Design a protein around this ligand. Structure first.
Ligand SMILES: C[As](C)(=O)[O-]
Ligand SMILES: C[As](C)(=O)[O-]
Ligand SMILES: [Cl-]
Lengths: 158, 157
């Protein structure tokens, strides 16, 4: 049965961010549509942002292409060029390696949802625009460090 | 990074051979992934006029595929038969799973869907409803019977 049942898919909350940063994703939840569907080459997540919530800390990927479509509510795409409003049907593309850190923020008083597609790759590196952090992802998970590879500090993550 | 859908070229027609070419009358699409500079997967927004179909019923060997209906109502046709699909409904087709699929617009209203497909150097698609397959690569693509011999007059006119 290729047709997915969204009401059955587990709703995920929280984040992999370290220390105080985990709290930054309060109001973000998601359904992993790709995994539910048995796909392995890319991920597909339907992400829901409560009022005030954000999709991620502002970043860009080195290895994975990313595509987003807003499905409901209204969002703000924040990148190097500033704020870009996004309504339902609006789409954004983030080519792997393009050093323009991006995030979506819900500044409205209603929930907003968006579809995000990202290539699955054995390894990944993301750089965070707004602070001295980067992450290295492999099959075992995520290693967050400063941009020089040294550990994140208490001053940084509590 | 924000795409302008009114600016992207609307594509029509099909690469299907002979009489099958016209089978995709009423199908048009916007290549969103190319528009956006993406290389690792394709994203197409496909519009089906009433009666139109997404493709001849088929499955991919090498590429994963994902679909969400964005507007209107469609029918997903696969081995198990007909499955109605309304806006927000999604379907996933893992590479290699031999369950051929197509979308058909049996309403009187246009319907649109988003399709994502992995880009790979080579691909094979088998067609479920007739003796045909297609092999693709960098060099190009070729429609043949499933045994690799040429499609016949009896088959494609
Ligand atoms: C761990 As991330 C690339 O969603 O900030
Ligand atoms: C759109 As097709 C997989 O029948 O070439
Ligand atoms: Cl035949």
């Amino acid at each position: 049965m290729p047709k997915l049942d969204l009401d059955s898919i587990e709703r995920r909350i929280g984040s992999v961010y370290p220390g105080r940063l985990n709290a930054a994703m309060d109001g973000r939840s998601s359904l992993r549509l790709g995994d539910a569907g048995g796909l392995s080459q890319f991920g597909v997540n339907l992400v829901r942002l409560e009022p005030g919530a954000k999709s991620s800390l502002r970043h860009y990927h080195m290895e994975q292409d990313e595509f987003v479509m807003v499905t409901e509510g209204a969002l703000v795409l924040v990148d190097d060029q500033g704020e870009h409003p996004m309504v339902p049907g609006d789409c954004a593309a983030f080519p792997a390696g393009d050093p323009n850190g991006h995030q979506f923020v819900n500044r409205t008083d209603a929930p907003a949802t968006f579809l995000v597609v990202g290539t699955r790759t054995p390894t990944e590196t993301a750089y965070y625009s707004d602070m001295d952090m980067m992450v290295k992802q492999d099959a075992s998970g995520f290693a967050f460090t400063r941009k020089d590879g040294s550990p994140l500090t208490a001053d940084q993550i509590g």
